[PDB]
Design a protein around this ligand. Sequence first.
Ligand SMILES: *[C@@H]1O[C@H](CO)[C@@H](O[C@@H]2O[C@H](CO)[C@@H](O[C@H]3O[C@H](CO)[C@@H](O[C@H]4O[C@H](CO)[C@@H](O)[C@H](O)[C@@H]4O)[C@H](O)[C@@H]3O)[C@H](O)[C@H]2NC(C)=O)[C@H](O)[C@H]1NC(C)=O
Ligand code: COH
Ligand code: COH
Ligand SMILES: *[C@@H]1O[C@H](CO)[C@@H](O[C@@H]2O[C@H](CO)[C@@H](O[C@H]3O[C@H](CO)[C@@H](O)[C@H](O)[C@@H]3O)[C@H](O)[C@H]2NC(C)=O)[C@H](O)[C@H]1NC(C)=O
Ligand SMILES: CCCCCCCCO[C@@H]1O[C@H](CO)[C@@H](O)[C@H](O)[C@H]1O
Ligand SMILES: *[C@@H]1O[C@H](CO)[C@@H](O)[C@H](O)[C@H]1NC(C)=O
Ligand SMILES: *[C@@H]1O[C@H](CO)[C@@H](O)[C@H](O)[C@H]1NC(C)=O
Ligand SMILES: *[C@@H]1O[C@H](CO)[C@@H](O)[C@H](O)[C@H]1NC(C)=O
Ligand SMILES: O=C(O)c1ccccc1O
Ligand SMILES: O=C(O)c1ccccc1O
Lengths: 553, 552
Amino acid sequence: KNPCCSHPCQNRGVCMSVGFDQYKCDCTRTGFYGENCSTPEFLTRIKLFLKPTPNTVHYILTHFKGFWNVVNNIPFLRNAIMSYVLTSRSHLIDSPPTYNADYGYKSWEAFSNLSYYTRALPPVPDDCPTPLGVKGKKQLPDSNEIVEKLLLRRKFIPDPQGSNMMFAFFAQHFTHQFFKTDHKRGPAFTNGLGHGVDLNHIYGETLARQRKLRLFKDGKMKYQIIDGEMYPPTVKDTQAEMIYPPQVPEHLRFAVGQEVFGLVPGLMMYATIWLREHNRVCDVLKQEHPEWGDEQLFQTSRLILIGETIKIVIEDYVQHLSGYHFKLKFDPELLFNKQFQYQNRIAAEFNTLYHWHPLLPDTFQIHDQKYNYQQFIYNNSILLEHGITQFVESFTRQIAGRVAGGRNVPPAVQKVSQASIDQSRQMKYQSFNEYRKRFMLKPYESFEELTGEKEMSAELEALYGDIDAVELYPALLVEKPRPDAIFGETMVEVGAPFSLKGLMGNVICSPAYWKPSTFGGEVGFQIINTASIQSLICNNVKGCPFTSFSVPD
Amino acid sequence: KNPCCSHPCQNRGVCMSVGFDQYKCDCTRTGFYGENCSTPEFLTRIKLFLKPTPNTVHYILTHFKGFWNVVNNIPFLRNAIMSYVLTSRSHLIDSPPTYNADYGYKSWEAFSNLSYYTRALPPVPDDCPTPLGVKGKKQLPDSNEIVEKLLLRRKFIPDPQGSNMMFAFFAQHFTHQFFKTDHKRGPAFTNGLGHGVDLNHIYGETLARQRKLRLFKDGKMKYQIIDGEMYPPTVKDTQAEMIYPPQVPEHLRFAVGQEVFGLVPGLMMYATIWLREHNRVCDVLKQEHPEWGDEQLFQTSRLILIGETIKIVIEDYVQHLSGYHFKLKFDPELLFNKQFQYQNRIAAEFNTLYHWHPLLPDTFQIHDQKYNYQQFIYNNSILLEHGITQFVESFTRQIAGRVAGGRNVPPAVQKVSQASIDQSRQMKYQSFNEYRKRFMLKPYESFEELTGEKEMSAELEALYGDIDAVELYPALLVEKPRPDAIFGETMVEVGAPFSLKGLMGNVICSPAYWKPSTFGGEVGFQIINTASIQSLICNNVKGCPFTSFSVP
Ligand SMILES: *[C@@H]1O[C@H](CO)[C@@H](O[C@@H]2O[C@H](CO)[C@@H](O[C@H]3O[C@H](CO)[C@@H](O[C@H]4O[C@H](CO)[C@@H](O)[C@H](O)[C@@H]4O)[C@H](O)[C@@H]3O)[C@H](O)[C@H]2NC(C)=O)[C@H](O)[C@H]1NC(C)=O
Ligand code: COH
Ligand code: COH
Ligand SMILES: *[C@@H]1O[C@H](CO)[C@@H](O[C@@H]2O[C@H](CO)[C@@H](O[C@H]3O[C@H](CO)[C@@H](O)[C@H](O)[C@@H]3O)[C@H](O)[C@H]2NC(C)=O)[C@H](O)[C@H]1NC(C)=O
Ligand SMILES: CCCCCCCCO[C@@H]1O[C@H](CO)[C@@H](O)[C@H](O)[C@H]1O
Ligand SMILES: *[C@@H]1O[C@H](CO)[C@@H](O)[C@H](O)[C@H]1NC(C)=O
Ligand SMILES: *[C@@H]1O[C@H](CO)[C@@H](O)[C@H](O)[C@H]1NC(C)=O
Ligand SMILES: *[C@@H]1O[C@H](CO)[C@@H](O)[C@H](O)[C@H]1NC(C)=O
Ligand SMILES: O=C(O)c1ccccc1O
Ligand SMILES: O=C(O)c1ccccc1O
């Protein structure tokens, strides 16, 4: 019935019903006119003709290494390039945010209610001819059949880019401070009201929890000392609730900022390292400020660690997955002369696309031991047996799975993968092709074009019938990867805007915050601008083991 | 003992303690350098030497009537001028926000906790030589003594700008959506978590309260018809709680968004009027969109009303207030090629400077009747007796009191005035002069310079001893008014940045929102862009009485 069900408005124009039988497109500031915002005004024809395709730009960034080695070493060029990267990427994000699961039109409820994920595309209206709008069959395919035929791993497919378990667990640990789906009320809702990198997965989401985890001496967080090494405190000692199955003995019930980080020893590894880092920075600041009290020591350490996080994400983590010969830079000053909003709201689609379960290995190799999922899960004694050093050394050397390219989701997390499909349907996601359009990509014209292959594409056809009916999550995981890359085109072109906006949008990157006095002075400031994944481990892990997000060659 | 107690860092530098006896100034992006951020850069001392005083800028805007009168009618020039007015003001506001009453250094707790008012200036550190830091006497003067000698009305002083009761109640009604002090917690905390113009004083602060006030038909808000006229619903009906004394009977306990608007019939008047406007807009939107449901009709009406509010506040309210010949313009597009943050956090100091009690008259005159405070307070019964039309006609013609110049606070609200001073001290406000500097104003060199007068300046020296020890709130009320103006310069040069930032920083003013589809098409969009205080009354008040913010 609803005339906007066909999504007729192109190029980010806004659809609106005008009576029962008609719609109107609001083309305001799209760069297009016409009844569907599909006629480029003169200046847009210029930009469009000159705009190089993402696969073209990816090629340039991933070749000509000698050229990039020069660019990387003349700050003016490196600054200029990193700047354009930042501004052109984040330009694709609505800020202040707009839609959520319950509102396909602008509303104060959608704007102001922080309990919702925001939405990059509005939900499909409730009464449309087909679940995605007007394209596809009256009912979407069985999600289980989708997972089995297209997603489930037959043979482990290693990541060609060489991503390891340090990468995989960093990704899980980092993103779960802002992907905290509140399933008690629905997939549309989040428990992370900071909607960004606030490090609540270390410090706790609420003040009450933070007070349970803090030592209230020297700004430090509570800990226990096992084998001369520092670990998180217990649930018993903190009264900070955690999710642990009954059979987990209480001395192994570690208490950390995020309730679920006891699920995997890989997560508890990072929680332990970051906890050490907090108390390390406390020691540094106390030496620099012996007049300071516990509260200021705590708050300043937190701000610094937020800065470390952001620095490491851009210059080690995003750097790794990009494959760029160009050296990414964390530098808030790049935006001080640019139009940029220092705020962000976590999008549900960003959550969906970050469901990188194919990364997970068939078993976890630590030292000379292999653990299946039954053995690894909720087993902190594994962490204690080997220690963090061995954990880093092993995880640095174990390869992760390729995310794109299909058929690499471990059967152990089958239902998780199916849930991603089901929940996206509950939240009335639009199609994969609509999301490509939303981020200035050409929609795929056929199933074979999407996969670059004849087998899986054929399965997609028999299930979906129309290429415009393929859903966001499955299509991201079966898309043709870029040459020897972990991801396909759409993952990166949709992902990076969400990510870079979230990172640079952080309040500490704003002019009023980005100054030495915010971080306790010059020494504190320096801790941020010299941070790396290697330094994070070297400072907090015994023996200073080598580490990296890729397996050594 | 705190080295930063003297507020050594000038020009918005950041003080930090380095050891028990030493400090360091962070002069980053101040445009200054040196130990105390006192020495200007070349670029800045040039910009400094050629930037005119606000008193000069004020004169220019308040004279040359003939010149401005043609400027107002050339859209290009009006836009350019309005564009600068916006950008210069707002740049004085830290955004994203920084300090609050509990944090004199930047912290995640200060940034993220919305239950606090933010602070334009950090609190005086606890362990300090004097309550204000370093200057002044060991103990501040008795707050009641300040009120009595300097603030209490001895004889009504009318506003020379002619502000009326329509103005005074608009001011109170509009600001009390974002000045909602959580007194149970402390003066440092707010119940207005939206921190701006969200019209929670109409729709309620929470979804739960909103659903008690809504009708869930045609997007409308609940109401009752009394003597053929639309009035807010009751507490009995909505179950939305209100603050009323037991003396008020059930049928007179009107329920509106803001819990305290039962206190004053002038507030309930505006509540009623804005209620009617909402339902009026629903009717318009329904004619345009027969296909729309109740929920979309409600939300779109709300967005439109937010727009009407910002429009009316800038082009009528701040316009009257300013006394400018230039016609201020509400136009979000003026900022689309400027750097500007569409976010805001309500400053405690913004709350304090808005304590404009001297506006209040000796009595309230509705038609042939006069009511003292005791009779007027919580009296919905006399709202029904006269009706909104009569309320508007009367309020338009009754003059308000002058806010600056001292000694014009109604004795009836004496202890409110004292509470304003006490709460300032509880929140550890810095001195008036520090706040002058904070907003790029020359500090006052003497008491006499502050009042331009001999008698009150003498009392201030007896009480405070040092000009650098005078507190923000009393100084604002005794400051030498601008000529024939309601305010002195400090009220304006501090208040306008808070105010314009919070107006233009509203989400509907952002590029993603400022478009006709947001408001249901051009018909809805046009409701915003042609709204005024006179049209708001003509549309929703029987008889379409003339109305203004100044007396006829
Ligand atoms: C952000 O959006 C969320 C999703 O809409 C909001 O969560 C929802 O909040 C509502 C309202 O608090 C809650 O509904 C409530 O329904 C009952 C009435 O509708 C209420 O019980 C009432 O019983 C009597 C009337 O029925 C009345 O006399 C009594 O005083 C109660 O008022 C019941 O307790 C229930 O809580 C939804 O359950 C909730 N939904 C979800 C999925 O969480 C959230 O509030 C929004 N946040 C903000 C700040 O507005
Ligand atoms: C790199 C990303 C990554 C990794 C490595 C990872 C590794 C692992 C892992 C390793 C041993 C296990 C047992 C799980 C198991 C789960 N994951 Co992930 N997950 C990841 C990204 C996500 C995200 C993102 C969500 C949903 C976020 C939310 O809303 O809470 C998720 C959801 C889940 C859920 C809840 C289902 C749902 O929210 O729909 C389970 C259970 N999973 N995952
Ligand atoms: C802006 C103009 C204005 C007007 C016209 C006005 C008119 C009136 C009025 C009759 C019309 C009465 C009976 C009062 C009485 C009060 N006002 Co005002 N007030 C005004 C501005 C304010 C502000 C601002 C606050 C503090 C708001 C907050 O924190 O909630 C305030 C606070 C109060 C308080 C709270 C006391 C405290 O602890 O601070 C009382 C009582 N008053 N006021
Ligand atoms: C914003 O900051 C507020 C001020 O710190 C904070 O309010 C404080 O909240 C804590 C909750 O942990 C309360 O702590 C006490 O609460 C009860 C009752 O006493 C006890 O069971 C606790 O153990 C503890 O003693 C404080 O009373 C409360 N303080 C005030 C002045 O309200 C808010 O919680 C902060 N907001 C957010 C979102 O974190
Ligand atoms: C309502 C009157 C105030 C009562 C409190 C008395 C405090 C001292 O009030 C005195 O009042 C005089 C009136 O013109 C002033 O000239 C004096 O300067 C003032 O100190
Ligand atoms: C957890 O790991 C320990 C070894 O560290 C092992 O002995 C134990 O059986 C494991 N728990 C399981 C497999 O449930
Ligand atoms: C800086 O301020 C301090 C405040 O005590 C003052 O004593 C000192 O002379 C000033 N120094 C300079 C270089 O301005
Ligand atoms: C309101 O009306 C008159 C004022 O003259 C007074 O007699 C009456 O008691 C007042 N009622 C309330 C509830 O204040
Ligand atoms: O930064 C990216 O390129 C990116 C892409 C996809 C998902 C998460 C990401 O950080
Ligand atoms: O708009 C102003 O100039 C102003 C000044 C002081 C207080 C509130 C205000 O809106």
